[PDB]
């Protein structure tokens, strides 16, 4: 029957139906897919990880709903930036594992799309046929919990990533460089100050350099992530993507 398309926006777009790469895409294939935008998802720049957890919970919930309702319906997923983390977490830890909550839907998953993916598998990337060069072969997602062995499954994946989009394309050798580590800290933190998962708690565990230096860099990274999330800039930056190859992908 009519397949389902689940979409998760990138940082800064808390409106499921609002403008943005995954929703724009869904709107270009509504003649072949049914569309379920993922809400209850703050798409927050910081703290991001709690935002990710909400998006993950909602994506899992919705998948179960639509797919239990129509057993003959296959599905696809599409996520951008923070949205790519949400889709990536659901795939890796809820669909793929032999006892994952969504594992019974694995045989029904046909296509997954990531743009600007912090969990992007090493050396796995596709061009968006645009003004930016595809991410290089020795780069991967910044996050340590990243996708692996995607080519080993029946579904097909598109992971669009530009060099210049650093968190989507870190060089393997740079993975534990200080600036990179603090970037990972910011993305995983529950908040700046608070419990075991705060930026400050993580900075202490990291060590290497004075705490004050780590606080300052974390702040500056947060100021920049916020700048991308909620600021009118041009439409030709590397963290942005042309959605059409992904459209021609969904359309098969």
From Swiss-Prot:
Keywords: Antimicrobial, Bacteriolytic enzyme, Cytolysis, Host cell lysis by virus, Hydrolase, Viral release from host cell. Coiled coil: none annotated. The keyword Secreted does not apply. The active site is at 81, 165, 239. Its EC number is 3.1.-.-. It comes from the Viruses. GO terms for molecular function: hydrolase activity. GO terms for biological process: defense response to bacterium; viral release from host cell by cytolysis. It holds the Pfam family Cutinase. InterPro entries: AB_hydrolase_fold, Cutinase/axe, Lysin_B_C_ter. The keyword Cytoplasm does not apply. It is an enzyme of class 3 (hydrolase). Endolysin that degrades the junction between mycolic acid and peptidoglycans in the host cell wall and participates with the holin protein in the sequential events which lead to the programmed host cell lysis releasing the mature viral particles. Once the holin has permeabilized the host cell membrane, the endolysin can reach the periplasm and break down the mycolic acid-rich outer membrane. Cleaves the ester linkage joining the mycolic acid-rich outer membrane to arabinogalactan, releasing free mycolic acids. Belongs to the L5likevirus endolysin B protein family. This is Endolysin B. The gene is 12.
